[PDB]
PDB file of C-alpha atoms (C1' of nucleotides) in Angstrom:
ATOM      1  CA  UNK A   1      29.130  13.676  12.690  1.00 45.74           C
ATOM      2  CA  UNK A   2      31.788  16.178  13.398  1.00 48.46           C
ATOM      3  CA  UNK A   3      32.740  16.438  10.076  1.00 49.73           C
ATOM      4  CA  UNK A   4      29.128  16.940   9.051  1.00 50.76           C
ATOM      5  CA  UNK A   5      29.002  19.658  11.368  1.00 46.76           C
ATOM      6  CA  UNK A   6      32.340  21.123   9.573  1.00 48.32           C
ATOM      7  CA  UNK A   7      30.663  20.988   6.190  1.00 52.74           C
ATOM      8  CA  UNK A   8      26.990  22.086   6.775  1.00 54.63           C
ATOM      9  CA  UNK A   9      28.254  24.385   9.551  1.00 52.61           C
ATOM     10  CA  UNK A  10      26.933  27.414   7.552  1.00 50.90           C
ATOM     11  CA  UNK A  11      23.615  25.948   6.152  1.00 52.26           C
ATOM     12  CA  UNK A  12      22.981  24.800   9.703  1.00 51.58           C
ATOM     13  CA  UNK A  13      23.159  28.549  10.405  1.00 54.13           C
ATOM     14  CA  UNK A  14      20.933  29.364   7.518  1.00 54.44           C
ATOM     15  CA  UNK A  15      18.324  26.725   8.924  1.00 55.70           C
ATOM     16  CA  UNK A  16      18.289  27.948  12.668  1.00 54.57           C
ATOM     17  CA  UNK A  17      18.227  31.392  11.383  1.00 59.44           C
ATOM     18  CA  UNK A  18      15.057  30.758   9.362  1.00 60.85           C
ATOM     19  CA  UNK A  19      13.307  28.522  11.858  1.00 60.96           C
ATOM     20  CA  UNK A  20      12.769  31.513  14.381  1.00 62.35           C
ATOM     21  CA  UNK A  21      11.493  33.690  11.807  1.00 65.04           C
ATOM     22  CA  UNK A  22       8.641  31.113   9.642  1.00 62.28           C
ATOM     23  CA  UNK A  23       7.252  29.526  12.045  1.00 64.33           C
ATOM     24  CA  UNK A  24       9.228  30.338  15.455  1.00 61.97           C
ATOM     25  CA  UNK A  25      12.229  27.913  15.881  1.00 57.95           C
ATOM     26  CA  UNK A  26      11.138  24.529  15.934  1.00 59.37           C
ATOM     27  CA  UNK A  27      14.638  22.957  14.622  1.00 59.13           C
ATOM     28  CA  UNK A  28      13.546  19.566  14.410  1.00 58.01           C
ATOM     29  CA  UNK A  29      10.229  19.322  12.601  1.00 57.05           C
ATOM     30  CA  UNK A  30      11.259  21.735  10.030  1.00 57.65           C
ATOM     31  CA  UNK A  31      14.086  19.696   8.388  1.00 59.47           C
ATOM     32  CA  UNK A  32      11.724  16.394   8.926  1.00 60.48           C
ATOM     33  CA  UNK A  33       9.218  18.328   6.749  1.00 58.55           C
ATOM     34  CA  UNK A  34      11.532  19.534   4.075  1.00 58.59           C
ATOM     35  CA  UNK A  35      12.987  15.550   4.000  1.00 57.01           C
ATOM     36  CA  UNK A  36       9.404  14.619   3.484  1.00 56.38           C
ATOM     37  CA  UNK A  37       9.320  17.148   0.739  1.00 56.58           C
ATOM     38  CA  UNK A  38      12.651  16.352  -0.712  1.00 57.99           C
ATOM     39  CA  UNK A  39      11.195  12.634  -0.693  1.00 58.18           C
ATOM     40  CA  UNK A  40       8.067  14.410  -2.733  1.00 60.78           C
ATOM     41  CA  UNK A  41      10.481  15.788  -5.175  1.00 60.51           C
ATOM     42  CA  UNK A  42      12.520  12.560  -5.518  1.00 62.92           C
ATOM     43  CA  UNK A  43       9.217  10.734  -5.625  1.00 62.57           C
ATOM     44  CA  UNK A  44       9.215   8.291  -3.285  1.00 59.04           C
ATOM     45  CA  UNK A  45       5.630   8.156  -1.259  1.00 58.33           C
ATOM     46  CA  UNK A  46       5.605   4.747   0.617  1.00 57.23           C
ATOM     47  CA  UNK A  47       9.014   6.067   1.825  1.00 57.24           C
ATOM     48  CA  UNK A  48       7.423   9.270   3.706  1.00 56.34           C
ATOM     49  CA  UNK A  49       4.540   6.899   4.996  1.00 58.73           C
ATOM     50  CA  UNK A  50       7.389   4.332   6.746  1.00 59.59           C
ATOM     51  CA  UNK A  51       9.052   8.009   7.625  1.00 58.74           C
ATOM     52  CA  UNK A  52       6.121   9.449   9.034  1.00 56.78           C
ATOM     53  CA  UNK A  53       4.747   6.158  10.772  1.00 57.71           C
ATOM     54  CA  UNK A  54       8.208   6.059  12.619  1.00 58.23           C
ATOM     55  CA  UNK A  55       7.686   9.532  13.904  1.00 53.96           C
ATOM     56  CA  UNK A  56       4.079   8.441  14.745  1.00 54.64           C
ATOM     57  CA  UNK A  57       5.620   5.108  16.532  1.00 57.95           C
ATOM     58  CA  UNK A  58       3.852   3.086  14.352  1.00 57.56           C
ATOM     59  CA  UNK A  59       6.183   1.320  11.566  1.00 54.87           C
ATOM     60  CA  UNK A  60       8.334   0.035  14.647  1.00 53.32           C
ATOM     61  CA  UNK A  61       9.415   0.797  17.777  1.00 51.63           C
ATOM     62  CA  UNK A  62       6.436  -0.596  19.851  1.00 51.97           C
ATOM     63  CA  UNK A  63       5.201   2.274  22.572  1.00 55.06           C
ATOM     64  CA  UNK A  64       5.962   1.283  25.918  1.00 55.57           C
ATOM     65  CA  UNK A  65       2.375   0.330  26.949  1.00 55.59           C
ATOM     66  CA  UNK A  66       2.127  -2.221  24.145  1.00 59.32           C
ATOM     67  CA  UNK A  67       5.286  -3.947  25.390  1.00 62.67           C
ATOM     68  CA  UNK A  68       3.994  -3.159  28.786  1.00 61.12           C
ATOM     69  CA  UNK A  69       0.729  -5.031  27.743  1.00 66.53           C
ATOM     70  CA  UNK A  70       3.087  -7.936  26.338  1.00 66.66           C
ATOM     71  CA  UNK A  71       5.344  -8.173  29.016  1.00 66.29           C
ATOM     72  CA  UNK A  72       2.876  -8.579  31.670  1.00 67.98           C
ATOM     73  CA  UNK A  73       0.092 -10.527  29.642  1.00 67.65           C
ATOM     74  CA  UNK A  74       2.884 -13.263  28.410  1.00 62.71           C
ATOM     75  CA  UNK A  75       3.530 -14.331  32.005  1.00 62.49           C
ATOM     76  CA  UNK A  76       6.947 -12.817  30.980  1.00 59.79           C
ATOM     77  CA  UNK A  77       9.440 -11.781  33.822  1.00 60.76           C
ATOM     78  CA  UNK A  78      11.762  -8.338  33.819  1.00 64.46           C
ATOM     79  CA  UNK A  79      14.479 -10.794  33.913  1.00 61.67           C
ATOM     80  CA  UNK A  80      13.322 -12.331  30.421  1.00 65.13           C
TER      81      UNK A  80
ATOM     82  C1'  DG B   1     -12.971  45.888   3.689  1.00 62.96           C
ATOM     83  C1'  DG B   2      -7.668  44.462   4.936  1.00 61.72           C
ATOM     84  C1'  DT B   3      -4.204  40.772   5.934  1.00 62.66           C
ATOM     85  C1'  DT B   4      -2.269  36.691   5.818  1.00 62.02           C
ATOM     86  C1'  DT B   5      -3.598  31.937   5.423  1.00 62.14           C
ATOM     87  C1'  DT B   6      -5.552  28.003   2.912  1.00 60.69           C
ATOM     88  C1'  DT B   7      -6.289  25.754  -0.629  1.00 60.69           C
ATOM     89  C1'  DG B   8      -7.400  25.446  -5.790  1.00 57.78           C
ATOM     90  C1'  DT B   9      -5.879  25.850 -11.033  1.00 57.86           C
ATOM     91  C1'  DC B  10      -2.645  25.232 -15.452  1.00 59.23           C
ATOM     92  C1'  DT B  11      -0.570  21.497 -19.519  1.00 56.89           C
ATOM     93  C1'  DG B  12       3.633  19.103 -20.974  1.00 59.00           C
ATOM     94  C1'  DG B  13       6.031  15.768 -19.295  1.00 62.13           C
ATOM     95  C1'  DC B  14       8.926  13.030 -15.888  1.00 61.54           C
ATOM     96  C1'  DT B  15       9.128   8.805 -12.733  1.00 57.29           C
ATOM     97  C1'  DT B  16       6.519   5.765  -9.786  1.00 56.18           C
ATOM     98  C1'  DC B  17       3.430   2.262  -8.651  1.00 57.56           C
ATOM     99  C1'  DA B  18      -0.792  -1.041  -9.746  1.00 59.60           C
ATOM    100  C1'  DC B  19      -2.709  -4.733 -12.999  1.00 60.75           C
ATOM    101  C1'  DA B  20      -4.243  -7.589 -17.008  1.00 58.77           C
ATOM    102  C1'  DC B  21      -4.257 -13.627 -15.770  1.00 58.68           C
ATOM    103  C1'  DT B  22      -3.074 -18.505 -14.214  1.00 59.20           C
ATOM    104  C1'  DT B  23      -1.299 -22.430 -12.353  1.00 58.30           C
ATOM    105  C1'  DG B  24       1.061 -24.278  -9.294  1.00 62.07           C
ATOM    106  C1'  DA B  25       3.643 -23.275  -5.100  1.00 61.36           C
ATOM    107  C1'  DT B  26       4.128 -22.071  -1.547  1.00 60.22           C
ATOM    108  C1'  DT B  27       3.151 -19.446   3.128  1.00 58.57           C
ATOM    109  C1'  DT B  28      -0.074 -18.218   6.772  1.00 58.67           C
ATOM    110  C1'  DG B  29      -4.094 -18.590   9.621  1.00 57.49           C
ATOM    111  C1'  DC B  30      -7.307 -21.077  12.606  1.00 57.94           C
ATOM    112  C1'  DA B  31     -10.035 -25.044  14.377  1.00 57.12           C
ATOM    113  C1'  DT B  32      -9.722 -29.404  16.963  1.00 58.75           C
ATOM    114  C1'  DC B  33      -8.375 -32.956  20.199  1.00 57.56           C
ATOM    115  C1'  DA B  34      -8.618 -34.507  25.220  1.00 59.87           C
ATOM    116  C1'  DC B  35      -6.846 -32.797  29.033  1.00 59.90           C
ATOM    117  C1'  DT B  36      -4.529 -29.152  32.955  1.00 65.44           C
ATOM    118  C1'  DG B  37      -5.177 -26.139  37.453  1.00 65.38           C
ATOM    119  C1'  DT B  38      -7.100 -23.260  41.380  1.00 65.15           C
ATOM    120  C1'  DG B  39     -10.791 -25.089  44.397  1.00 65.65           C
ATOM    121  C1'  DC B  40      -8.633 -28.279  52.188  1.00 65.13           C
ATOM    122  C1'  DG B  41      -5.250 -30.498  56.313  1.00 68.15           C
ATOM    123  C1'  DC B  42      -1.092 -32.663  58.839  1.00 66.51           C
ATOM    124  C1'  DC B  43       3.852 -34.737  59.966  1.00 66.96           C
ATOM    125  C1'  DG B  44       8.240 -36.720  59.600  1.00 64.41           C
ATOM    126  C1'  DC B  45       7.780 -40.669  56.485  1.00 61.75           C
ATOM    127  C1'  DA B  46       9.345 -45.387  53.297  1.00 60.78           C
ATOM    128  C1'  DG B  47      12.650 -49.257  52.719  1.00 60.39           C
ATOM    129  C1'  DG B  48      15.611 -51.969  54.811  1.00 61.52           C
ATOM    130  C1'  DC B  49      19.047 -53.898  58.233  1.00 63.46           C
ATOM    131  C1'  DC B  50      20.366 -55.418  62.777  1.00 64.39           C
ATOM    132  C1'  DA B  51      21.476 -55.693  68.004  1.00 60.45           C
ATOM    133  C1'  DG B  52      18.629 -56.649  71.700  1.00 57.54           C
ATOM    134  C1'  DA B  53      14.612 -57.412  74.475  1.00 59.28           C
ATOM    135  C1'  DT B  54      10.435 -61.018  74.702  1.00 56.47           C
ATOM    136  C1'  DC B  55       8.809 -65.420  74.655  1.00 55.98           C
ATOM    137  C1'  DC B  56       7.343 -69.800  74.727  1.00 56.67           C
ATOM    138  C1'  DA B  57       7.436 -74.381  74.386  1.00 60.25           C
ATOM    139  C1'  DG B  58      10.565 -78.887  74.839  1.00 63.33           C
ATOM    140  C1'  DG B  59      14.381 -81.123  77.303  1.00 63.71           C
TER     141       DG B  59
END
DNA sequence: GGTTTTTGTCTGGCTTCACACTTGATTTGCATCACTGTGCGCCGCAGGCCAGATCCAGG
């Protein structure tokens, strides 16, 4: 990690600086879109749908009322 | 009408994914069976062993 900060600690300039001026500075969503993109170019399409299902909570992860809803509807104790 | 956005196009050509069928060969899903519990209370019990108070009939 800190060595990919020493070796895309220039492009990660070039990214911040064109965040603020496209579409305002959103630093996260605009690298997840060009990864979805990238996937596009290297033509892989089920990929981006488990990609974009994550970052919907869908493809895992479980949102906390479903396990809420299993938790309690199981008979299931915290301690279990 | 401008201004930027939002979608459309191209054809040649690249990979990427679905399917044509079939016969087992699994794996996965769902009914089916005869039942459960929550429908009310209360306190010392049970089982057994033994020293000691009753007792009751024969000498």
């Amino acid at each position: 990690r800190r060595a990919q900060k020493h070796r895309l600690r220039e492009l990660k300039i070039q990214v911040k600086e064109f965040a603020d001026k496209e579409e305002g500075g959103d630093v996260k969503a605009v690298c997840l879109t060009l990864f979805l993109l990238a996937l596009r170019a290297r033509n892989e399409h089920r990929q981006a749908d488990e990609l974009e299902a994550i970052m919907q909570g869908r493809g895992s992860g479980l949102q906390p009322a479903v396990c809420l809803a299993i938790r309690v509807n199981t008979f299931l104790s915290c301690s279990q």
